[PDB]
Amino acid sequence: SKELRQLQEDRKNDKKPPPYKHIKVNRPIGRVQIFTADLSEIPRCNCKATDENPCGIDSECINRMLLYECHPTVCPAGGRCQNQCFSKRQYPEVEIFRTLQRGWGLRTKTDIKKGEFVNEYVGELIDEEECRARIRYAQEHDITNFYMLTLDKDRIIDAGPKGNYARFMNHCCQPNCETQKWSVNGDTRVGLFALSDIKAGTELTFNYNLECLGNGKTVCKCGAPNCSGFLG
């Protein structure tokens, strides 16, 4: 109970989170590269411009089904294509709030429908050498908040120093969002998507699936009845 009493006090006193730079797109650091592909490598889906909601959430779209974003100059549905979520950056409105046991969190200001694009997990894109250095620094300074998610081998998104609102989304063993790795313009991106209808005011969470680098020993405080005890 000793730690809880302190947490009650902290929640009262903590007016704002530590500063970070709010950015729109991933920022490669050092020798990290972002890759591109020729347009010939972007798939054309099965949607037609005459369909009710071409390439939409509820459509038959194979690109959406395989986690490929359509390209606007290529998609058979043309300007009616509803599968350009990462590039268009239309996110549901959200706000940061202070939790008791899980630091700062994020809650939605609007209703969100099952399958809707919620956010892109954006940050600095760093290599293993840089990740280890940052994790070691944090550990040496008793920092227990990590914002690192692997994109692929030797390319890690660190939303700590620079990121967007997705950096505030906490882990839950019964979450209402999930990460998905998509191919956008010939390279990988990490999106957050709603698992169910979510009501305005609700905290947005996802299952970290042990991907948050540095949290491998962390005890989960999500409070779900099916809690694994860890961030995954």
Ligand SMILES: C[S@@+](CC[C@H](N)C(=O)[O-])C[C@H]1O[C@@H](n2cnc3c(N)ncnc32)[C@H](O)[C@@H]1O
């Ligand atoms: C991506 S940040 C989420 C925002 C963070 N709570 C903050 O104050 O900035 C991930 C960190 O939040 C904490 N965290 C998130 N979910 C948690 C959970 N279910 N149980 C315990 N700590 C959690 C851990 O310290 C983790 O390293």
Ligand SMILES: [Zn+2]
């Ligand atoms: Zn389509």
Ligand SMILES: [Zn+2]
């Ligand atoms: Zn399309």
Ligand SMILES: [Zn+2]
């Ligand atoms: Zn849990």
